[PDB]
């Protein structure tokens, strides 16, 4: 009856945007009070607690989401009706919309808030407030959302269930691969280059896996074919005429 039910997408968008607004306000309030000095007790009180709480929470959330999606997976995937498959495709598109919003929040907003925070302060630790919000909050969040989208597609849609989509694998792993690349960021800003320049090669890894976002181009196409074959000839006669 309801092929396009957008309640999940709206809930996810509202939650993510409210959370990031709260994070931005917290950054504004406590960036100067406690984020300037890394050896001060207020740094531990107001910034390290976020890290120590958020890494295990992110890991648990990702593992639980993957496990729940695999547990509640459809067993007779190939016997899905066209209407139910269309609804599943719509839910996957909602997953990808939330993923794109999270990708903007992580890879664009906080990544350049990094450029500005590093230009205002003298770096004294590998965990700055900008680093804490960017590397250890936003990237894992969109990695969790990518895991959710990938496993929903694999467990609900027959096309993605039989085999592994190369575009989906790229778009789910490459943007996640920036998180291990934080090790190269830390190594280059401590031994290789002594200056806070963004065009430094130590950030080329950041660039390379960023290209993996373009993998979404494939995934959308893989959905569109599934949409096309679902509409049929007569429905095509409706849409193209």
């Amino acid at each position: 009856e309801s092929v396009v039910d957008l309640r999940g997408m709206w809930i996810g968008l509202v939650l993510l945007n409210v959370f990031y607004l709260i994070v931005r306000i917290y950054e504004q309030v406590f960036g100067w009070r406690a984020g300037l000095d890394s050896f001060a007790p207020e740094f531990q009180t107001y910034w390290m607690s976020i890290l120590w709480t958020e890494i295990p929470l992110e890991l648990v959330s990702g593992l639980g989401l993957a496990g729940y999606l695999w547990k509640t997976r459809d067993r007779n995937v190939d016997a899905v009706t066209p209407r139910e498959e269309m609804r599943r495709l719509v839910v996957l598109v909602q997953w990808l919309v939330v993923y794109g919003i999270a990708i903007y929040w992580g890879a664009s907003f906080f990544t350049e808030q990094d450029g500005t925070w590093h230009m205002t302060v003298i770096r004294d630790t590998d965990f700055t407030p900008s680093h804490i919000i960017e590397f250890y909050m936003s990237y894992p969040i969109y990695s969790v959302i990518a895991v959710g989208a990938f496993f929903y597609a694999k467990t609900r849609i027959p096309y993605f269930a039989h085999g592994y989509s190369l575009a989906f694998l790229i778009v789910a792993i490459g943007p996640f691969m920036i998180i291990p690349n934080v090790g190269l960021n830390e190594w280059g800003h401590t031994f290789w280059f002594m200056e806070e320049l963004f065009v430094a090669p130590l950030h080329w890894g950041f660039v390379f896996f960023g290209w993996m976002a373009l993998g979404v181009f494939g995934v959308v196409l893989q959905i569109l074919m599934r949409i096309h074959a679902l509409v049929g000839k007569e429905g095509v006669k409706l849409l193209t005429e």
């Binding site: 999940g8 809930i11 959370f19 994070v23 917290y26």
Partner: peptide, 23 residues
């Protein structure tokens, strides 16, 4: 106030899990 952002991240994960498992 050093436990505000951690508490909001947990509230987000919980509200998501409950509401999305219902839908």
């Amino acid at each position: 106030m050093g436990w505000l952002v951690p508490a909001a991240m947990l509230a987000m994960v919980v509200i998501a899990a409950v509401t999305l498992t219902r839908l």
